[model samples]
Target chain A: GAMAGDGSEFLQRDFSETYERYHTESLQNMSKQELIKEYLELEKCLSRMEDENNRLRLESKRLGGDDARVRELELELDRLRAENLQLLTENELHRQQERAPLSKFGD
Target chain B: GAMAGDGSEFLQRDFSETYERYHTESLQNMSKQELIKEYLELEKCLSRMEDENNRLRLESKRLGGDDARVRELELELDRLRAENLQLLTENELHRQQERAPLSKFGD
Candidate 1:
């Protein structure tokens, strides 16, 4: 059974004698139950969609939107990684600069 | 002038006599232009919403939605940061372990 939903099912169909009539005639002459039900379906779907958009909008901003915070932060992460690598490569008990004068003798 | 748009203008209104009739009567016996025009606007709006939702969906995935890739990567960044800090605290030319033996003589 293709039990999708009420509002989306109607909206998805082709516009025509039956479809257009549904939209048109339903307005003027629909049963109270049907009208309210239809309204509920449409309203609910529209509301959720609006909310979804809002959620996405906030996320886009959190990540810096357009330019995106994710990328910027990733950039910083890489910088720190390279810095850590160089730091780890050095001897831990003496400053590298302490040996700078000794290198002059070798030169 | 508050010129919103066509489709939204109608959908936003309260459901009632005119509104109900508009939906009901429009279907059974309405102008062809109006029917087709309404369809066009509705379709366009629906299409854009679907697209907007899709765009958001992709971005969410890109950032590792649910648990979120953003937070995961940030964890890595902080780890590198603390690592960098400790590394920088050490002398650059000698391993700290190199001085461990010298401490025994002082004892």
Candidate 2:
């Protein structure tokens, strides 16, 4: 017997319609959970990288304006940071836009 | 009947031991898949960020050594880029170290 905590037996294929619906719903739920988990992991990684970038910039500057190589890398890093921030902002905006339709229904 | 592509019936709780093993194995497979997917996404994001950083560095140098504020940001960015690369290298090494045991087992 395919038992469930909710007292609903895992619907068998004899009830193909219900079973199909249940399977599809479960798959979607699992996928969404995975997506959120992955997103958070990526965000955590990016945050750490960002902190390192900041520290590098500060240290290079404090090195007394010498070392042409250090100065060169510093400029490059600034540009990259700005570009990365733009990408993040765009991603957030896109996410909010996607959720807008569902939120409208709730309100 | 919970059917399979190979026409095997979905194992039921009557065979709880077998079902549990199968379930655990499937969960591990899914986790491994998710980790690979997430790692790839992070790699892609990092690559883009690196390219932008490079462009910024080049542009700043071409601007004739003026703009004190720009120069300052540039230096900071350089430091961060180096730190970010170090982090990336460490992560790759850690991942390889983790996979080593599994590969050894296979060999």
Candidate 3:
């Protein structure tokens, strides 16, 4: 009932008053076989779209991940590099002083 | 030329021999108004699909970025952390030596 009403309703639907692209309807008179073929074609289109949509979704999911982690690691790495540089400088100063810093470690 | 040939070619499209949904055509008999409406409806469908396709393309493009950068940083960060830990251990061992390591620098 709804299909018939809806079909006929859109049957006269004014395409001109809507989104612009030009208007009108004759697909309704299609033979059952032709209609089915058209339906199948539409089905094929919808299927391809679904496949592409799913692939895009996966791409988005995979690429958008670990950003927070990456940012965190970046800050952490910068902090360590600075800290390490200071330690290296300290080691060099000790060497310049000839201070036997690690002489006692193994002994 | 191509369209007319293609139209006629698909006109006898055997849906039964194809992807299953059944097949046939009376759409060829629709009025100009009806055909226009049908064309408009198809245009609407294609329009929607294009919008969706573009959005998905953006999503895919955006999310698929910076993976190599993320991996590079992760490796560098791990390397730095190990180096820093070694430096910390050296600092601790120096303190145990109580050899006045930095006292000479200032004095």
Candidate 4:
């Protein structure tokens, strides 16, 4: 009852003793069939998680690529904005430059 | 009689009889509202699954492309590693030749 099949291999301890230890302390109240069910369930969940993780990683990469495109757009927008600012500033500077001669004439 | 919706849209079976079958078996307990909720949840979950699956398929394709890139890198790395090892081995062989006796037992 205690020994496993073949009994050729050595164990860390006796099977019966291990069972007793588990029964005494561990809360793994599942039967062998239940354990099998739990194991399969765990595998199913893990496979799902791995698949999801890979998918999410790919999505992240896609989004990241789109983000880079957006940055380029932002740079283009900023460059246009700067050009507009520069034009306005130049216009102001030219106005100031033209007013210098008028002020001298008033003097 | 357990007719549903004035029996205009007739059902294949009596609603109450169906309920009785479900209740009698007692595999699981759910009310009409609960059943509706469960079905709704199932639909929601299934729809989500479908959306996610589609997203994942696109992601997989993208990652598959990246995986190809990664595989190419790995192969290149392996080739480089092999070349590096070969160079190192040749260097060692040259060093060994330098130490090799120059047929000092002069015939």
Would you estimate the TM-scores of all the predictions? Answer: 0.32, 0.20, 0.41, 0.26
What ranking of all candidate models by lDDT puts the best one first? Answer: 3, 1, 2, 4
The DockQ score of candidate 1 comes to: 0.13
Candidate that would win on TM-score: 3
**Range of the 10 consecutive residues with the lowest summed lDDT in candidate 4 chain B:** B21-30
Per-residue alpha-carbon lDDT of candidate 3 for residues A1-107, written as tens digits (9 for 90 to 100): 13343323223433343334432223433443454455456646756776886787667666665565677778878888998898777666566566444454333
Candidate 4 DockQ category?
A: incorrect
Ranking by TM-score: 3, 1, 4, 2
Candidate 4 Cα misplacement greater than 4 A, ranges: A1-43, A46-65, A101-107, B1-54, B57-107
RMSD of 2: 35.0
Interface RMSD of 3: 12.5
lDDT of 1 by residue, A2-66 (tens): 25423332222233445453356544344443444544455456568778778876775564332
**Chain B TM-score of model 2, please?**
0.29
Compute the interface RMSD for each candidate structure.
15.9, 36.1, 12.5, 27.9
> Model 3, which residues run further than 4 Å from truth?
A1-26, A29-69, A100-107, B1-58, B61-64, B96-107
Question: Clashing residue pairs in candidate 4, if any?
Answer: none
Off by over 4 Å in 2: A1-30, A59-107, B1-107
Per-prediction TM-score, chain A only?
A: 0.33, 0.29, 0.41, 0.36
lDDT of 2 at B75: 62
